[PDB]
């Protein structure tokens, strides 16, 4: 009957929020493009409290972590190429002839380099791939670099490695990462088995298109994830149970000559052909791909009803868009992934699929324009050993569904992995009625009001407290300190100098909640209660501040006389 | 806005020791440099400028038909181009011949203002951090 | 320096009459020098009227 407001600090409550997370690298230097120095060392053992009774709603397609990863990887890519040589004096008209052998793919190009010595003009010979070389005239021998006229071409430093390294994202103080531990999760929906993690699992930022290379696999069955499943033109991420294997080789052996540009800067180019001119023939085991296509078309028939499903190749066009593109060995491959999607299923030649591939050195990454990167050639054969881990399918009318290898920007290459994780902002302050007057972190979040009110200590303890990454981290830490001082000042103005639980003695009106203490301190989670009194939060807070502290302060001011 | 007339207080103001003026100077310089930083540098343009005059409250001698040799997108090839310049932006060289240069490019990294950046003044309010305040003098004279 | 603040403002109207065209000369890969083009009309002078 005689109920009073009591303020509880450290409540296991949260709401959806978007922030910047700290990148952490495995403890395990190589100057790898995604800099190790930027990212903190990983904790030796992660903690994964298995939140019980918590059924949170996840949605891969509205997830700020994916966009944050896109921005972070773009920033790290640009910063890694910042101090490397810029190929400004190489737009010169190139006299090119076909290499005497593929046919016409490699061009023997002569050009006059005018070095910074400025008393010589050196005629030099170099080999360029056909994809990077475009005509400039009706003369069949005069060409230029493909994108050097509308962009500044940055040469990648040969000392930068492109080998994938697992990168974790760890929550800052004041936020939490909730992981969905289900096995057949469909990306968008409620999750029945939720845990809280400080950092995510190892994520290899593999860059590829039409197909996801390396990474985690499904545990129960092949999982097909799409936001709507009927609008079309929405990537149908496919995660597999068993991994096919993309063995890929570039047979040709090449020698890398260097040409001075300025004092301490060099353009690394292709010297001459050693051995015969072969082609890059990626080998995929046909039987295994058969099985994978079966285990995918079954699920697609389940989702799209028993229609005939046809896997077609992508629509024709320029090689960069249409063809699959590895990041293996430091050489950018573009493979004609047509034999893999050439089947009608409804309801015999060879045993290995050989995909031809073309190597390209001048590239435009992240779908940007006006910027371009030159990858210097690698001496010797390149022998990949990748693992088929996922597919990206897109849809296009006689009762047949046409699926094609499609995809999108690199965000869709990480929705396939960060589909079991969500970032949540925690608001530790809450209020509840009591009779008085003046496990791990969120482990009791799904528990009732009673017996969750005994664990605020851990949540209160663990909730709070150079360069571009530096400034972002400084802004994040300052914001966290701000939040913490917001909470502490709210507690101070409420007369709770240092009391996780502080009784107010403000009367508990019956227009907020009419439920009795038994039905308020049991039968409900802190989430349902915080939602319930959401509208009255401002009013209640006002009453805790105005009605008491002021009056209590005046009273104590009047007690010493 | 939150303005509170302070009664019974008389305060000594001195604008010539007002640190806000220097702070605004730093602010404006930094804004100018920030706005001009992601724009075109005209260093490749500073060349021997062989410039004639333009034949027309009429003007006389102010606008000059000024030509120079520039590199095209192929680097090796050169192209002859022309533009009109005012007398003030050009400096004579080689005594009294028609060769000119661009003023101050002998010692400064001439930056071009991006055309999409507007120089229109917009009112700027200065606000102090919490724990500080700004006292306004309301005496008419 | 002596700073004078006035009771009432004085309108000043300034005109640049000479009609202009902008020509863009490429400096490099995606860098433009925006500059003078042809002059349209007669060559008068820019004046301020107070």
């Amino acid at each position, epitope marked *: 009957e005689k109920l009073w407001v009591t303020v509880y600090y450290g409540v296991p409550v949260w709401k959806d929020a978007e922030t910047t997370l700290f990148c952490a690298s495995d403890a395990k230097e190589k100057h790898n493009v995604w800099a190790t120095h930027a990212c903190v060392p990983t904790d030796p053992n992660p903690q994964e409290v298995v939140l019980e009774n918590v059924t949170e709603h996840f949605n891969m397609w509205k997830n700020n972590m994916v966009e944050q990863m896109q921005t972070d990887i773009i920033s790290l890519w640009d910063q890694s190429l910042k101090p490397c040589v810029k190929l400004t004096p190489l737009c010169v008209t190139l006299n090119c002839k076909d290499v005497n052998a593929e046919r016409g793919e490699i061009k023997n190009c002569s050009f006059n380099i005018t070095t910074e010595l400025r008393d010589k003009v050196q005629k030099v010979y170099a080999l360029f791939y056909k994809l990077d070389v475009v005509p400039i005239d009706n003369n069949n021998t005069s060409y230029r670099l493909i994108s050097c006229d509308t962009s500044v071409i940055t040469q990648a430093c040969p000392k930068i490695s492109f080998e994938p390294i697992p990168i974790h994202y760890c929550a800052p103080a004041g936020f939490a990462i909730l992981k969905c531990n289900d096995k057949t999760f469909n990306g968008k929906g409620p999750c029945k088995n939720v845990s809280t993690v400080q950092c995510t699992h190892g994520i290899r930022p593999v860059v590829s298109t039409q197909l996801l290379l390396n990474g985690s696999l499904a545990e129960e069955e092949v999982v097909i994830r799409s936001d709507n499943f009927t609008n079309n*033109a929405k990537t149908i991420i496919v995660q597999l149970k068993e991994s096919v294997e993309i063995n890929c080789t570039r047979p040709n052996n090449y020698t890398r000559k260097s040409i001075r540009i300025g004092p301490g800067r060099a353009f690394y180019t292709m010297g001459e052909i050693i051995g015969d001119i072969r082609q890059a023939h990626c080998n995929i085991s046909r039987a295994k791909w058969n099985d994978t296509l079966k285990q995918i078309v079954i699920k697609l028939r389940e989702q799209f009803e028993n229609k005939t499903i046809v896997f077609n190749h992508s629509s024709g*066009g320029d090689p960069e868009i249409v063809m699959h593109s590895f990041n293996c060995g430091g050489e950018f491959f573009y493979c004609n992934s047509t034999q893999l999607f050439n089947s009608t299923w409804n309801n015999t030649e060879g045993n290995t699929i050989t995909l031809p591939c073309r190597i390209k050195q001048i590239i435009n990454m992240w*779908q940007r*324009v006006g910027q371009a990167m030159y990858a210097p050639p690698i001496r010797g054969q390149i022998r990949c050993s990748s693992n088929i881990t996922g597919l990206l399918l897109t849809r296009d009318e006689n009762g047949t569904e046409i699926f094609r290898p499609g995809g*999108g*920007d690199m965000r869709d290459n990480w929705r396939s992995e960060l589909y079991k994780y969500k970032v949540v902002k925690i608001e530790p302050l809450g209020v509840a009625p009591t009779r008085c007057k003046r496990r791990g972190f969120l482990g009791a979040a799904g528990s009732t009001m009673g017996a969750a009110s005994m664990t605020l200590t851990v949540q209160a303890r663990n909730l709070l407290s150079l360069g571009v990454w530096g400034i972002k981290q400084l802004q994040a830490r300052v914001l966290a300190v701000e939040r913490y001082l917001r909470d502490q000042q709210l507690l101070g103005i409420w007369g709770c100098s240092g009391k996780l639980i502080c009784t107010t003695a403000v009367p508990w009106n019956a227009s907020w909640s009419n439920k009795s203490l038994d039905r308020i301190w049991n039968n409900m989670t802190w989430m349902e209660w915080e939602r319930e009194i959401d509208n009255y939060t401002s009013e209640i807070y006002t009453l805790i501040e105005e009605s008491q502290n002021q009056q209590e302060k005046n009273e104590q001011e009047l007690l010493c006389l | 806005p939150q303005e509170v007339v302070l009664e019974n207080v008389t305060e000594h103001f001195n604008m010539w020791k007002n640190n806000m003026v220097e702070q605004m100077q730093t602010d404006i310089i930094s804004l100018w440099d920030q706005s001009l930083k992601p*724009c075109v540098k005209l260093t490749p343009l500073c060349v021997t400028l062989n410039c004639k005059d333009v034949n027309a409250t009429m003007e006389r001698g102010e606008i000059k038909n000024c030509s120079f040799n520039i590199t095209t997108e192929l680097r090796d090839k050169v192209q002859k181009v022309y533009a009109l310049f005012y007398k003030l932006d050009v400096v004579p060289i080689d005594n009294n011949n028609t060769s000119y240069r661009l003023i101050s490019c002998d010692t400064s990294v001439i930056t071009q203002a991006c055309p999409k950046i507007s120089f229109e003044p917009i009112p700027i309010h200065y606000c102090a951090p919490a724990g500080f305040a700004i006292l306004k003098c309301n005496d008419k004279t | 320096t002596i700073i004078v603040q006035l009771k009432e403002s004085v309108e000043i109207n300034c005109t640049r009459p000479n009609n202009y065209t902008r020509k863009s*000369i*490429r400096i490099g890969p995606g860098r*433009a020098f925006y500059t003078m083009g042809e002059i349209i009309g007669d060559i008068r002078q820019a004046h301020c009227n107070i």
Partner: antibody
Amino acid sequence: QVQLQESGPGLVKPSETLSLTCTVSGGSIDDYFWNWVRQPPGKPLECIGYIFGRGGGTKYNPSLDNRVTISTDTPNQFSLKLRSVTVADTAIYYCARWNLYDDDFGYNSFAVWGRGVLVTV
Amino acid sequence: DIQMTQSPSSLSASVGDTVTITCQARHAVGKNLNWYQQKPGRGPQLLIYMASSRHSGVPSRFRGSGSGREFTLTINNLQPEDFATYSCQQGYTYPWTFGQGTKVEM
């Protein structure tokens, strides 16, 4: 205040050469791609080709089997030549200015369009 | 080439309502999208460039945003002068394909 005006015949029979001329008023030709585009009835706009500056590099929509040639005739006029015109080529043809520079409005977009001329077959 | 589609093919609206037009790319184009306005008897006008930047002199009411293959143009407070055919164009690969076009009716 750059304006573009197309001119040329409004009726060309099949298989001869279709000739159009875009004249630039207001300003002289400058280092922006000058592009010919068309809109057939009931179809989206299709790029035909472009030329850079006053004589220079060109590029043409690959899916036309090299039937198109573009060149500059006068410092304020450029022209489109389209060979082997067929009945499918009836369209409203526009000439447009495509910007290369990110320091001005309309970066990588047809900032300036002409009125457009309807050519049938 | 890269196929572009948009939705709806046509819609009706009155003065003062908000209109949303979705442009979908068959392949990712980054932020390199432009929005054009076409009226009878007049050449196309540029409304938005680089998918979120309004062109000079365009009314503030026109708002456009997106990334990857997905973009949306929102016209708030529809004016009688804004009834026109709106189209989206890419900018990454040449030819820069346009789109079917959405006609805004009274």
